[PDB]
Design an enzyme around this catalytic site. Structure first.
Site, PDB file in Angstrom:
ATOM      1  N   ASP A 267      61.237  35.796  65.497  1.00  0.00           N
ATOM      2  CA  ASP A 267      60.680  36.606  64.423  1.00  0.00           C
ATOM      3  C   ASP A 267      60.156  35.731  63.291  1.00  0.00           C
ATOM      4  O   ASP A 267      60.734  34.683  62.978  1.00  0.00           O
ATOM      5  CB  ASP A 267      61.729  37.572  63.869  1.00  0.00           C
ATOM      6  CG  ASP A 267      61.163  38.502  62.815  1.00  0.00           C
ATOM      7  OD1 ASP A 267      60.042  39.011  63.010  1.00  0.00           O
ATOM      8  OD2 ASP A 267      61.840  38.716  61.788  1.00  0.00           O
ATOM      9  N   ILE A 268      59.064  36.179  62.677  1.00  0.00           N
ATOM     10  CA  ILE A 268      58.418  35.461  61.586  1.00  0.00           C
ATOM     11  C   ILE A 268      59.049  35.906  60.270  1.00  0.00           C
ATOM     12  O   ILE A 268      58.807  37.021  59.798  1.00  0.00           O
ATOM     13  CB  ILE A 268      56.903  35.698  61.578  1.00  0.00           C
ATOM     14  CG1 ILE A 268      56.291  35.319  62.931  1.00  0.00           C
ATOM     15  CG2 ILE A 268      56.252  34.912  60.446  1.00  0.00           C
ATOM     16  CD1 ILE A 268      54.869  35.809  63.115  1.00  0.00           C
ATOM     17  N   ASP A 311      56.032  41.331  64.077  1.00  0.00           N
ATOM     18  CA  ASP A 311      55.920  39.878  64.003  1.00  0.00           C
ATOM     19  C   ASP A 311      56.714  39.178  65.096  1.00  0.00           C
ATOM     20  O   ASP A 311      56.520  37.976  65.310  1.00  0.00           O
ATOM     21  CB  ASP A 311      56.387  39.356  62.637  1.00  0.00           C
ATOM     22  CG  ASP A 311      57.491  40.197  62.025  1.00  0.00           C
ATOM     23  OD1 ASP A 311      58.115  40.986  62.764  1.00  0.00           O
ATOM     24  OD2 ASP A 311      57.732  40.069  60.806  1.00  0.00           O
TER      25      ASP A 311
END
Lengths: 970, 970
Positions: A267-268, A311
């Site tokens: 995940d960003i 994301d």
């Protein structure tokens, strides 16, 4: 009067397919089809030349140059036929071979016309007419070349006859009739050649029509299939659709278990901030670059991307093929992902980072639902991998003990303390570690070329038709062929009527005018004009009253009625050709000269006639020897008229080759019987008189005529000529019918394979129902989630570890895929399912996007309500209490397909994220809508309730409403 | 001299297929094939009758009865042709239709021979020969009927000619020549009919050969497949074998997971005592009755039997289709089993009882290994079910808590205290309960009939042969047909040489002996004898020197060379037929009589000839009018001789129909040109003399002859007759070639489908490699068990719950299935695998059981050692330490297949139980053998070690040995 002439001049612009490559391919087909036709042509021309040789050899004196020139012509034709029968003779030269053949025919004509004796203007008409018709019908030459050759042959014949026979007082009548004959022959051949050259081009062009549609429809399916699409699942599903498993108590689930996998979620961190500052375009460009980089690293690290979740990129190693280094693969993937996002942070200046969670365990992988199928993975190990990501540290890989065990200690790890950061990891006491360090037209033309090559023509002909009957072996094939309708029939009838007019003018010019003859010809003309009128009413239906339109349509639409009318027309022309011959003299002149000279008939020579020629000459139209009937000195023109009638049989191209054969043989038998049986005295009198006139009677001090008939008895020549014409017409009809049937057969295979392809397209599309980028300014987005499905989903053995729950969710999704299939929801497109979440949107397709009424928004609200009612129905019938939340929002999105090797159609943008937050914040059994959606629905008399201010991540405080009911049904 | 006549009399026995049903089916085929042939026959006979009508009608007086009888015959033939062309006319009457046609032909002959005028012994020979040949070649009548009809027609012609023409002095020469002609026709027709009637039966019979082999090989595969065989697994495997998955890094495992199953194990307490008291037969009968009763109860209780494990029957409910009452199904199965064994105890007097253990849980079910595939189930739940049986109480059902939970409380249960009786149930603290209370030939002929019906003959003909060329459309089909060789060619050459001899005798009888003629005939005879000799060398290769044998084989084996020899022979016969005709007189007699009477040729009548008949008569063999050459008064026999040569063309059946057509047309053209052009004076002279001789010259006081030629000019009749014969011979050749090609085509489809079926059989057999009862007195049995595989088998997620271990065991079994595939082990058969246990036996197949040397026992010991070495190899390469135990024993067993609905081949007996105890007692990495096996191996110089006394259940103390090494490799 002038527009018709201009249209005729427009006809004379030789139609040509514009593409020289397409024209070459057509020529290759036409030459392959006609190579046999060309060799049959050569054989028939040889036969006719042999007939002319026999006629000229039956009577000396034998002129050496005549024999030498004919022998050379035969030799050249045989050599060319042998070359063209060797497969190595290039087809482009067949056209030249035809022009060379015309030149050979020209040479044969010159010697054919100068040398023969006795000299007459009637000699050689029959073979000239034959050669002309054969060049129009069996020689595959271009229209301009056919016309030029026929005109040259005609003018050369007339000029030769004028030079050799200038001394005959009646020459003009013969010359006019020869002119008339040659004019008729020049016309009918065009009217036979031009429609055929048109229909074959049409048949070829119509074939290029359907084949293009076939390829076009394949082309439409291709990009579909492209963007549509694991090959094993897709091929299994393709087999199942062939199974047509209607009437199954459950929708077939496509699940395969794989253990020994490693699951990576990445995940960003901070992405919502970037996505709150970038435009939709800049955001989608950055996301697509980032995810294309991750797609590359995943392919390099043997990691299968399963899904993108906002994301978050998540992938599994060990799918679909189990591998022992799956945990190492996922760890290295997570490292390369953290490096790639560090580089993206450095390039974009956006302080993004990545959390990576890695678990190692088992998964069931497969597809659920009916529409927008996506390959997914389900297991408690996937949930733990997700909690491992959410409990990870940004820029660090957080791994479970299971993964660490699969790493064999190859990586340095510290205690991750995941249970300090993740409640799930704490409750389950999962030991956790952090890793420190280690052209479409050209394709159409090629496919068509390959099919022409593989669809061999003599084989297809021999396969799809019976050997002798020439009927299709299948009665249904013959019924389809019998349903093919003609429309130029009236033009052929008009041509036959023009030939009739020429015949009338010839008869009026040569044969003395008789009230019986004129009345009979008038009657035939009236009948033929009536038949022409009835046939033209089909072309001009709008101008005539209803009963005549119905009669004309019933005739032309009935191949039987048009065939009967053609046969009747031909029989009338033949009757007109000889009923007047029954008014020719029949008293014997030869017994009369025998009585005047008192000499024996076997001693009567043209000299004894010339001694008593004072009493009897060809110039007398009064019945000689006191006959009340006039003399008909030129009966061969009836034979030529019959030849014209045989040529008229050619014009009715669609009369069955057997039907043509029977009609032509009946004409032949009747006319030969009339020439031989009743006419024999008239023919002997005419042959004797013509022999005397051929003698250039001059100061013949002695009764020494040239002797020797010098000509084959015309009674014997006429049958042979007629039989040769009937043979050639049979062979032409056979070639024509075989060509039309082959073109039809290929058109049928093209249509059948096209229909099969449309069926297959509809088939694949039904199962789906069962860089490309676009900016869409106004899309409505719905998320509908089953809120308590996580409470129903129990992975116990008694529940097949939850697979039965996944079957029930499939049915829940199937109902939703059925509802979203209603025509009223055709403006709605399902985007994807996500677990128990149904994702739909509206306004993504310009063909259904109403710019003015925003009807797609109404349809989406009505769909959301119909889903809430379907959920109630499902709860009532499944004995469950599934509570559904629905989030609606409107606004701009970017749609596109990501992945050059796995094209996934999807939509991105703040609108989707807000819709997803409206669903995530939805009250159970309530439809939550945004303020913009509330404004649109309230403007359309929807019943909406104000929920109030909801805290939306990345937006702060947002006013939200409940949609409680639709507008009242009108 | 007499043995040849006896063989000829053996030939005269009409061959007939013995079965009236098979003969009827052959007749149905032959009639369907020949219905068109019969109608073509009728059409050609009509054509010949029309030719005879035209010849007789060309000259009055027209006798009314002749015309009436011919019209009636034509009418009858047309009516019969229309009936036979209606599909509703039964084919059994076609034979009668042929006999009726013979009768019609007979009637045509009588009026054909009595009425015609003028009378001559040469009149009507041509049409009689035609009809005879057509009956031999186009009429499908039985040999006896054909011979009787030809003899009757011949004798009737000769008797008529003898009665009408008895007064002619030269009658004998004509009569002898007519006899000779008819003799030739009677011979040649037999020599054409007999080989054809034989080859068609042969072609039909040879087809029944291959089709039987196809069906036979299918029949062999059927029982195989029967005893071989879940349908889903078997069909998947059948699909996979079609995939030919060569080059896979792993052997495809066939495993499917099923949860919610109930597993029942039921063991017979005390069975070892009964099996120690019953004989092998009584034991196997009792076991098969008991297990067939349990198989029935299992089918009634919806329990799937998985396996039998000695006395233990085990089955699963919920397989392969999941069901909710699986636990109830297994409980009721266990009750019915306990009742059935109580009944068996009551009937047999043997105090047997049953323990039943039932667990409810999950299983993986599937197949492992490569050979002797059996459907099995694996799970911890199966192991617990087994321990529940072993911990059960006899006559009581012992169930787990899991099963009790699935029973919904419908059964009363007491605490089972299973952990008191089973260590496994105690250690795992498994709560346990005890339930208290609630004809091939006819199939071949039918399949062949259906194929004959579906393989329609006119369609197959039209599909697999080109329309005009008659060559097979595929060049490979034409190459196969061109490889079909003739073998009776030499018999045809012999027949042609006999025809040549008959022609020579005719020529020597009618034509005066000339040194030129005799020398020419001698030369032709020597050449023909040389060709006969060279051809017979093919039939009699062994009697002649090598170069001549090679030449003869190269001629007969080369259809081109044999064709060339046939053409050369026919050309020689034609030359012999007319070169002597060039020695007939050529001076004109008619101009000579014109000079003698001083009358005009047009005034020369047979009366003016009779005035000067004194000088010229048919009796003069000296050249009339001062010619030095003799008179040939009967040149029509040359035409008849040419007809015989055309009949000779029939005998060379294998000359191409186009090649025959070209040869026959060349014969026709040359002979007609010789009759018309040079012979015209000879023919006119002969017609005049014959016309005078036909007049029964008597007191003709006035020159008033009967007048009228009364006959069609023979020069005109001969061409028409020849053309009609060429047409009929072309049609016959076309029918013959179409028949031989259809018989070939069906033989090819039969062979191709047979080869495909043999491939499919070999295919299924490779994958298997990759009441029926037999008592076998001396079988060697091996059990080879992997002792520590239970320690390697770990059902952890990291091991795909053990599926990877099951893959490794598959490879271990594959190696063993490869080793047991060695040709040296062809005497060994794998019986089954059981978990990690390989079961093999030797001496079970009489074709491989060495009764004397017991080589199969050596092969089994060498296999056991090769397995021990393979296990070492596997341990080295898999980095494992699998220790193998092998138990060997020898002795009697009963082999059989149990289960009418699931035939399982297996072997029972004390020998198997002792072998299994030798394996169970084997030391790891040691081969344990019984005393009897020790005795056999020690007698064969095997290195064996004495293990000592081992306690074997049911046998007490038994001496056992280790096999430590084989005999030294010789």
């Amino acid at each position: 009067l002038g527009a018709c002439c201009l249209a005729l001049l427009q006809i004379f612009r030789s139609k040509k397919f514009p593409s020289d490559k397409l024209e070459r391919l057509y020529q290759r087909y036409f030459f392959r089809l006609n190579q046999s036709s060309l060799t049959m042509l050569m054989a028939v021309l040889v036969l006719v030349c042999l007939v002319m040789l026999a006629f000229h050899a039956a009577r000396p004196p034998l002129q050496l140059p005549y024999l030498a020139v004919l022998a050379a012509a035969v030799g050249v034709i045989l050599i060319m036929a042998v070359l063209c029968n060797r497969a190595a003779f290039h087809q482009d030269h067949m056209g030249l071979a035809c022009y060379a053949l015309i030149a050979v025919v020209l040479a044969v004509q010159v010697v054919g016309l100068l040398l023969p004796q006795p000299r007459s203007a009637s000699e050689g008409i029959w073979w000239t007419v034959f050669f002309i018709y054969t060049i129009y019908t069996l020689l595959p030459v271009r229209m301009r070349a056919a016309v030029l050759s026929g005109v040259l042959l005609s003018a050369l014949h007339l000029a030769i006859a004028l030079r050799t026979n200038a001394q005959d007082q009646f020459l003009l009548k013969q010359l006019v009739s020869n002119v008339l004959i040659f004019s008729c022959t020049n016309i009918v051949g065009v009217c036979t050649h031009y429609p055929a050259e048109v229909s074959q081009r049409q048949a070829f062009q119509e074939t290029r029509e359907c084949i293009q549609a076939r390829l076009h429809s394949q082309r439409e399916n291709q990009q579909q299939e492209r963007l549509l699409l694991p090959r094993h699942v897709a091929m299994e599903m393709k087999a199942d659709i062939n199974a047509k498993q209607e009437d199954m108590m459950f929708h077939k689930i496509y699940i395969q278990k794989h253990d020994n996998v490693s699951i990576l979620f990445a995940d960003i961190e901070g992405f919502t901030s970037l996505a709150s500052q970038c435009t939709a375009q800049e955001l989608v460009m950055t996301l697509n670059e980032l995810f294309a980089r991750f797609d590359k690293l995943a392919a390099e690290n043997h990691c299968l991307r399963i899904k993108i979740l906002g994301d978050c990129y998540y992938c599994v190693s060990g799918l679909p093929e189990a591998r022992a280094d799956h945990a190492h693969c996922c760890v290295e993937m997570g490292m390369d992902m953290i490096e790639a996002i560090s580089l993206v942070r450095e390039v974009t200046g956006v302080n993004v980072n990545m959390r990576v969670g890695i678990h190692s365990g088992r998964v069931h992988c497969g597809v659920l639902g009916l529409r927008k199928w996506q390959f997914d993975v389900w297991s408690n190990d996937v949930t733990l991998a997700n909690h491992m990501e959410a409990g990870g540290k940004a820029g660090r890989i957080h791994i479970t003990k299971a993964t660490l065990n699969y790493l064999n200690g190859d990586y340095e790890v510290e205690p991750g303390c995941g249970g300090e950061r993740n409640a799930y990891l704490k409750e389950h006491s999962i030991e956790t570690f952090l890793i420190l360090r280690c052209n479409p037209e050209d394709e159409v033309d090629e496919f068509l070329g390959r099919a022409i090559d593989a669809r061999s023509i003599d084989r297809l002909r021999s396969e799809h038709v019976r050997k002798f009957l020439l009927t299709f072996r299948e009665p249904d094939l013959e019924k389809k062929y019998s349903k093919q309708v003609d429309d130029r029939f009236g033009a052929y009838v008009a041509c036959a009527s023009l030939v009739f007019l020429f015949i009338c003018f010839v008869q009026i010019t040569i044969v003395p005018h008789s009230i019986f003859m004129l009345s009979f010809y008038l009657t035939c003309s009236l009948l033929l004009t009536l038949v022409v009128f009835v046939s033209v009413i089909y072309s001009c239906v709008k101008l005539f009253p209803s009963p005549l339109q119905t009669l004309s349509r019933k005739i032309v639409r009935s191949k039987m009625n048009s065939t009967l009318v053609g046969v009747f027309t031909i029989t009338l022309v033949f009757l007109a050709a000889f009923v007047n011959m029954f008014t020719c003299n029949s008293r014997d002149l030869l017994g009369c000269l025998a009585q005047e000279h008192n000499i024996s008939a076997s001693q009567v020579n043209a000299c004894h006639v010339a001694e008593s020629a004072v009493n009897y000459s060809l110039g007398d139209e009064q019945g000689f020897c006191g006959s009340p009937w006039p003399n008909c000195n030129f009966p061969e023109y009836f034979t030529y008229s019959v030849l014209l009638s045989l040529l008229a049989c050619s014009v009715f191209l669609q009369i069955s080759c057997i039907g043509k054969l029977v009609l032509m043989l009946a004409i032949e038998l009747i006319y030969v019987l009339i020439v031989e049986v009743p006419g024999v005295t008239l023919f002997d009198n005419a042959d004797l008189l013509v022999t005397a006139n051929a003698i250039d009677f001059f100061n013949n001090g002695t009764s020494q005529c040239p002797e020797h008939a010098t000509k084959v008895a015309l009674k014997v020549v006429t049958p042979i000529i007629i039989s040769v014409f009937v043979l050639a017409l049979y062979l032409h009809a056979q070639q024509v019918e075989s060509t039309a049937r082959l073109d039809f057969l290929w058109k049928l295979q093209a249509t059948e394979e096209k229909e099969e392809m449309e069926e297959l397209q509809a088939y694949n599309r039904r199962l789906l129902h069962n860089l490309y980028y676009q900016s869409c300014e106004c899309v409505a987005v719905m998320f509908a989630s089953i809120a308590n499905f996580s409470e129903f989903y129990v992975e116990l053995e008694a529940n097949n570890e939850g697979v039965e729950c996944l079957r029930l969710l499939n049915e829940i999704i199937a109902d939703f895929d059925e509802i979203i299939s209603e025509d009223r929801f055709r403006q709605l497109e399902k985007i994807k399912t996500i677990g128990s979440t149904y994702m739909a949107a509206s306004g993504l397709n310009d063909s259904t996007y109403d710019k003015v009424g925003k009807t797609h928004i109404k349809a989406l609200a009505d769909f959301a309500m119909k889903l809430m009612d379907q959920m109630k129905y499902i709860n009532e019938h499944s004995f469950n209490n599934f509570q559904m939340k629905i989030g609606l929002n409107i606004g701009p999105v970017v749609a596109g397909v990501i992945g050059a090797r796995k094209p996934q159609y999807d939509i991105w943008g703040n609108t989707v994220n807000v819709a997803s937050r409206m669903d995530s914040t939805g009250v159970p059994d309530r439809i939550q809508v945004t303020t913009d959606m509330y404004q649109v629905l309230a403007a359309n008399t929807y019943q909406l309730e104000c929920r109030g201010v909801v805290k939306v991540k990345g937006k702060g405080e947002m006013m939200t409403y409940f949609l409680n009911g639709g507008p009242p049904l009108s």
